Design a protein around this ligand. Structure first.
Ligand SMILES: COc1cc(C(=O)NC2CCOCC2)ccc1Nc1nccc(-c2cnc3c(c2)[C@@](C)(CO)CN3)n1
Length: 336
């Protein structure tokens, strides 16, 4: 009766509003893309909610080509849609737009980040639907992804690795305390500011709003053992995946991939945690932090807050962030 009337009032219109309005409407989109395809009307449905004065609807409409447009080439591929730079034609403000087909759209894409006030989570500017297309609007982060920095740099020095992992665990701590599982923590889903000083989580395509059995695992190399074994999953899956991302930043390669072929699910269930992939040259507190994040039993695995403390303390132990922003190529680990 509360959500039922809110969505009835919001449907068929683009409005300026709050997170709860967008979130409520997003659930009806997730359900629509489950239904069988219908014949399209003359004028497409246009509905949704903009959360910033930077993106202004015009007579309750916000349509691509008319009110805003993408310019230049794509920022990349998210789990469920391509991402572009866009500009509101009225206000001139630029942002990022992810374009998701309705039949692959999960409301958790917006529920996980709508109205969250963390510097470690990419701000959501709103989302608008044009018939079978959901446009998700977010703050533009000029530095690109951590995943792209690792490809370009080969791998990162320990202090830079620790610094970004630290900022990611602050993000994960904020989410976990609000019963949100990210579900795809990897370097590709961390974005950097232009000076490389700020990191923020993006792409909540795999998010669940909580223990659960509905978790769609992302990248097989970053999956926690409890996921593979088809067991109950909590926030700890994100802690495991964050330490897989750490191994990736230090080594320049995903864990497992340089030692095993075929589907890795079996190997992740059967093998010891990939603690052997920890560089011998790493500081003791660094190795201890990754070891406690890569415990196979989730109950014994440290929390995002706990790993965050250890990682902050590991960064102090190596002298803090000294390494330069976009330094010289560092050769990734060779296969054996
Ligand atoms: C200038 O800004 C950006 C530049 C670049 C960039 O240089 N790309 C080059 C890299 C080399 O190949 C060609 C393209 C990337 C992101 C930017 N900013 C940005 N800002 C907000 C959100 C998002 C975003 C949201 N959800 C995402 C992603 C990104 C994915 C695709 C990131 O992997 C995954 N899901 N991204």
């Amino acid at each position: 009766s509360v959500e039922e009337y809110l969505v009835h009032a919001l449907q068929g219109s683009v409005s300026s509003g709050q997170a709860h309005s967008l979130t409520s409407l997003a659930k009806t989109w997730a359900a629509r893309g489950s239904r069988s395809r219908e014949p399209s009307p003359k004028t497409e449905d246009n509905e949704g909610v903009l959360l910033t004065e930077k993106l202004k609807p015009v007579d309750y409409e916000y349509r691509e080509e008319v009110h805003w447009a993408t310019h230049q080439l794509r920022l990349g591929r998210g789990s469920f849609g391509e991402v572009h730079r866009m500009e509101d034609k009225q206000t001139g403000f630029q942002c990022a737009v992810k374009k998701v087909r309705l039949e692959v759209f999960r409301a958790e894409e917006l529920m996980a980040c709508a109205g969250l006030t963390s510097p470690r989570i990419v701000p959501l500017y709103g989302a608008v639907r044009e018939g079978p297309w959901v446009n998700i609007f977010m703050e533009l982060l000029e530095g690109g992804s951590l995943g792209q920095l690792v490809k370009e740099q080969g791998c990162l020095p320990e202090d830079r690795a620790l610094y970004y992992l630290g900022q990611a665990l602050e993000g994960l701590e904020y989410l976990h305390s609000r019963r949100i599982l990210h579900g795809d923590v990897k370097a590709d889903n961390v974005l950097l500011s232009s000076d490389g000083s700020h990191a923020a989580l993006c792409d909540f395509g795999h998010a669940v709003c909580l223990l659960t059995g509905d978790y769609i695992p992302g990248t097989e190399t970053h999956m926690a053992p409890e996921v593979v074994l088809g067991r109950s999953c909590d926030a700890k899956v994100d802690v495991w995946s964050s330490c897989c991302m750490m191994l990736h930043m230090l080594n320049g390669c995903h864990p497992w991939t340089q030692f095993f072929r075929g589907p890795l699910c079996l190997k992740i269930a059967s093998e010891p945690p990939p603690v052997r992939e920890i560089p011998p040259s790493c500081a003791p507190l660094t190795a201890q932090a990754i070891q406690e994040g890569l415990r196979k039993e989730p109950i014994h695995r440290v929390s995002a807050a706990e790993l965050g403390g250890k990682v902050n303390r590991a960064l102090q132990q190596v002298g803090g962030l000294k390494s330069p922003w976009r330094g010289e190529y560092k050769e990734p680990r060779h296969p054996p």
